[PDB]
Amino acid sequence: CTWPAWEHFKRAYISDGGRVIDPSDARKITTSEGQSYALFFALAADDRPMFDNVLEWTKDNLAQGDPGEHLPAWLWGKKDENNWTVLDSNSASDADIWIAWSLLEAGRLWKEARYTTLGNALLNRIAKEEVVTVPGLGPMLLPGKVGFAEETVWRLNPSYLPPQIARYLTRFGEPWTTLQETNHRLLLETAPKGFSPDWVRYEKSKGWQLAPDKTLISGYDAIRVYLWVGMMNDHDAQKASLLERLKPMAALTAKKGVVPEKVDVATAQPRGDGPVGFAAALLPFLQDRDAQAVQRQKVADHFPGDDAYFSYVLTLFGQGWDEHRFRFTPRGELQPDW
Numbered sequence: 001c002t003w004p005a006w007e008h009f010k011r012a013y014i015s016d017g018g019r020v021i022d023p024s025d026a027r028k029i030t031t032s033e034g035q036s037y038a039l040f041f042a043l044a045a046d047d048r049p050m051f052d053n054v055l056e057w058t059k060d061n062l063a064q065g066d067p068g069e070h071l072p073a074w075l076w077g078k079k080d081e082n083n084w085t086v087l088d089s090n091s092a093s094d095a096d097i098w099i100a101w102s103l104l105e106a107g108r109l110w111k112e113a114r115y116t117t118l119g120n121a122l123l124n125r126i127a128k129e130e131v132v133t134v135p136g137l138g139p140m141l142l143p144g145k146v147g148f149a150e151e152t153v154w155r156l157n158p159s160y161l162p163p164q165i166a167r168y169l170t171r172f173g174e175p176w177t178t179l180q181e182t183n184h185r186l187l188l189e190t191a192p193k194g195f196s197p198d199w200v201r202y203e204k205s206k207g208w209q210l211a212p213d214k215t216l217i218s219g220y221d222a223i224r225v226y227l228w229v230g231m232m233n234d235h236d237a238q239k240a241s242l243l244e245r246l247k248p249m250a251a252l253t254a255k256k257g258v259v260p261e262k263v264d265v266a267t268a269q270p271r272g273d274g275p276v277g278f279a280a281a282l283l284p285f286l287q288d289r290d291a292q293a294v295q296r297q298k299v300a301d302h303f304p305g306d307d308a309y310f311s312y313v314l315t316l317f318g319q320g321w322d323e324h325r326f327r328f329t330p331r332g333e334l335q336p337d338w
Contacts (some may be wrong), residue, residue, distance in 0.1 A: 001046070001338075002045070003041075003044070003045045003320070003325055005315065005316055005319065005320070006041050006042075006044075006045050006047070006316060006320075006325075009041070009312060009316060010050055012306040013306070013309060013312065014038060014050070014053075014054070015057075017053070017057055018050070018053035018054045018055075018056060018057035018058075019034075019035070019054075019057045019061070019076075020034030020035055020037070020038050020054070020309070021034075021309075022034065022309040022310075023306065023307055023309065024307060024308070024309065025077065026078075027077035027078045027079075027087065028077055028078055029075060029076065029077035029087065030057075030061075030062075030075075030076045030077060031074055031075055031076075031092070031095065032058070032062055032072040032073065032074045032075075032091070032092050032095035032096070032099070033074070033092060033094060033095045033098075034309065034313070035054055035057070035058040035062065035072070035095065035099070036094075036095040036096075036097075036098035036099045036102065037098065037313045037316070037317075038050070038054045039051060039054055039055060039058075039098070039099060039102040039103075039106075040098055040101075040102050041316050041320075042054060043102055043105060043106050043109070043334065043336075044320065044325055044326035044334065044336065044337070045325075046336065046338045048106075048110060051102075051106060055103075058072055058099065059118075061076055061086075062074075062076060062086070066121075067099065067118060067121070067122045067125070068117075068118055068121025068122055068124075068125060069121075069125070070125075071091035071096055071122075071125055071126070071129055071130070071145055072091060072095060072096060072099065073086040073087075073088060073089045073090070073091070074088055074090055074091055074092035074095060074144065075087040075088040075090075090144045090145060090146055090147060091129070091130060091144045091145040092143065092144055093126065093130045093141050093142060093143055093144060093145075093160050093161075094143070094157065094159065094160035094161075096122065096126050096130070097126065097141070097160065097161060097162075097165060098165075099119075099122060100119050100122045100123045100126060101119075101165050101168060101169070102119075103115045103116070103118050103119030103122065104116060104119040104120070104123070104168075105333065105334045106119075107119060108333075109334065109336060120172075123169070123172060123176075126141075127175055127176075129145045130142045130143075130144060130145045131175050131179065132149055132154075134154050134202060135204055136202070136204070136205075136207065137182055137202060138178055138181075138182050139174075139175040139178050139179050139182060140154065140156060140179070140182055140186075141156075141160060141161050141179060141183070142154070142156070143155065143156065143157040143160055143199075151204075152203060152204040152205075153201055153202070153203050153204065154201065154202045155199055155200070155201050156186060156199070156200055156201075156202065157198065157199055157221055158186055158187055158190060158191075158196045158197060158198075158200065158221075158222060158225050159196070159198070159221045159222055159223075159224040159225045159228070161179070161183045162224075162228035162231075163180075163183065163184065163187070163228060163229060163232055163236070163238065163239075163242060164228065164231065164232050164233070164236065164328045164332035165228075165332055166179060166180040166183045166184075166332070167180060167236060167238075167330075167331060167332040168331055168332030168333060169332075171331075184238060184242075186200075187225065187229075187242060187245070188241070188242070188245050189208060190208055190210065190265075191245055191246060191265070192210055192265070192266065193248060193264075193265065193266065193267065193268035194245060194246055194247060194248030194249060194268065195218040195222070195246070195248060195249055195263040195264075195265050195268060196218055196222045196225040196226070196246065196265070197216050197217060197218060197222055197265045198215075198217060198218070198219045198220065198221040198222045199215065199216075199221070200216065200265075210265070210266055211266060212264065212266035212267055213266065216264070216265040216266055217262045217263060217264060217265055218249065218260075218262065218263040218265060219261065219262045219263075220310070223259070223274065223277075223278050223281045223282075223314070224281060224314075225246070226246055226249055226250075226281065226282055226285040227281040227282070227284060227285060227314070227317055227318055229242045229243060229246060229285060230243075230282070230283070230284030230285030230286070230318075230321070231284045231317070231321050231327075231328055232328060233327070233328050233329055233330045233335075235330040236330050236332075243285075243287065246285075248268060249263070249282075249285070250282075250285065250286050250287065250288070250291065252268075252270060253282060253286065253291060253295070254286070254288060254290075254291035254294075256270075257294050258273050258274070259273075259274040259278035259279055259281075259282055259295070260272060260273070260274060261273055261274045261275075261278070275308075275310070275311045276298060276299055276302040276303070276304055276308075276311050276315065277304065277308075277310055277311030277312070277313075277314030277315055277318075278314070279295040279298040279299050279302075279318075280295070280299045280311070280314050280315040280317070280318035280319045280322075281314045281317065281318045282295055282318065283295055283296060283299070283318040283319060283321065283322040284318055284321045284322065296322065299315060299318075299319055303315065324337055325337055
């Protein structure tokens with residue numbers, strides 16, 4: 001009853017103490033993102049021992065022992081020859097959200113009230129520290145607790161709140177009820193050519209900043225937008241509207257046979273070939289049987305090695321969903337494959 005790609009990921013990328021190590025950083029870093037993804041994959045795999053191992057490392061080393069009182073620091077690793085510690089105390093809200101959702105779903109599915117308590121506390125802390133009311137938009141999720149909000153300009157990351165997780169979180173009331181609506185609009189309104197940006201700015205009295213720009217690109221963050229949308233349950237009434245908006249990414253991938261590495265959000269111009277992780281990330285997204293099969297062949301023949309954290313986690317998400325390793329319900333709950 002095992003998931004072999006996850007078994008190997010545990011052996012090759014997760015320390016005995018429970019931290020996900022990106023081997024491609026000289027500092028041998030752990031990110032809150034790596035931890036949150038490990039929590040999700042452990043829950044999908046019905047792997048409570050690794051879930052607890054990862055969670056305990058996260059709370060003690062990223063959150064001063066209590067994510068309910070401290071948002072996890074996003075970056076941890078080797079600072080000096082003699083000091084392995086937090087490298088950046090700032091948060092990353094995509095990770096905070098995935099941790100909170102994974103805690104709530106583990107508490108529900110494993111019937112363990114402590115996961116629920118910690119997830120509820122973390123979710124309230126996310127709301128307190130990195131959800132703000134933006135004039136003209138309403139409540140929005142900032143990419144982190146500092147550094148993305150100023151008096152007249154805000155910067156958002158469309159990949160940071162998967163639509164199905166937003167749908168799930170509405171069960172806890174405001175601000176999650178309204179955040180689901182503002183997130184849906186964010187995804188539709190900032191993809192004027194059908195490509196979602198890594199990062200997008202909103203300016204007071206001016207609206208979204210969508211003029212052509214070298215930093216307004218569908219790249220290594222925005223690839224996950226298409227992934228999240230593809231993994232929505234078909235009975236979520238809003239999946240269709242998101243697939244329709246983002247359909248040019250599917251058409252471009254199918255035409256080329258290769259997922260582009262970067263696409264200019266304002267002009268739709270592609271450049272570069274994405275890594276195997278981008279191929280896997282689009283498996284749930286591509287609705288055409290043939291285009292999907294072309295990417296499936298790439299993932300099968302170029303499966304990521306032990307030196308490729310990013311392509312590996314994208315592959316666990318996309319190939320995992322492609323292999324029915326997990327599903328989401330129409331409300332964004334985990335539909336486990338146990």
